[PDB]
Structure formats: C-alpha cells, structure tokens
Amino acid sequence: KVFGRCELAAAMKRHGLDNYRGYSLGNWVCAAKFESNFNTQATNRNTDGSTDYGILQINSRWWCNDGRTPGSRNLCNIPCSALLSSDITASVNCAKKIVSXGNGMNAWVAWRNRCKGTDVQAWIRGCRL
C-alpha cells in the first residue's frame, strides 16, 4: 500500500508515535517518506546480505528475521514478512524497540540525512489528526 502523508500521520498517531522517545510525529512521517516513500512493501537489499523491509525499512541483520541474513539477531522478535503488511502495526512496534536501543532515530539513515536538522513539523501540518 502507498500511504498519503496525512493518512500515514493519522495511522502513526493512532499507534502512539507522537513524541515516542521524544520524537514528534513529523519525525516519523519524514522518516517514512525518505526510507520508503510511504510504500509498505518497500524492500532494499544491502551488501552485507541483509534486507530492509517495509514502511520504515527495518533491517534483517538486527531487528527482524528473514531466514536468509547472516548474523541475524531478531531483536524485534518478528518475521520480516510481517513488516510488509498494509497495516503498520508490526512495523511500529518494532520501530519503538529500534529507537530505544539504534541510538534514537539515527537507526534510520534516511531520517538522519534528510529529516534531522529540519523543521519536521511541516510533515504533519494541515492534517486533521
């Protein structure tokens, strides 16, 4: 599923992400925009044999189990395929564990580069939340 901006903001709010770990809702929307372009089925392979899965591009070496990644730790205790669902619940629950570890939201390289240091509130502005 490809979400719209405010559509996703509302879904993330419903799952308690506003100010989770101190990160305002716009941070999470911005992260999804630049990690996956709001696409719940996004997948991207990496040189280390891992793959990043879903709306928040959750990695299969540390966080989810995809059965094919050397060194898998499965710290979210979730199969990676569940992170490709149209409903964001499993991805949000794993993201809450990631942000509590991957040194806050720096675990999301696209957020680090393309969101951090900008006025991320613009990502929720004008949404009926």
Ligand SMILES: O=C1C(Br)=CC(=C(c2cc(Br)c(O)c(Br)c2)c2ccccc2S(=O)(=O)O)C=C1Br
């Ligand atoms: O249940 C839904 C569904 Br279905 C779609 C959308 C939207 C939308 C708009 C475009 Br344009 C787009 O390309 C996509 Br995908 C979705 C949308 C609609 C009105 C205002 C803002 C948005 S937006 O801020 O969410 O974009 C909102 C909800 Br709620």
Ligand SMILES: O=C1C(Br)=CC(=C(c2cc(Br)c(O)c(Br)c2)c2ccccc2S(=O)(=O)O)C=C1Br
């Ligand atoms: O399937 C949809 C689609 Br598509 C759009 C919308 C909404 C919406 C629509 C427009 Br237009 C807009 O500019 C904005 Br912002 C939000 C909406 C979202 C959350 C709360 C209230 C509305 S409400 O405004 O519809 O009451 C709800 C459903 Br369900």
Ligand SMILES: [Cl-]
């Ligand atoms: Cl702006």
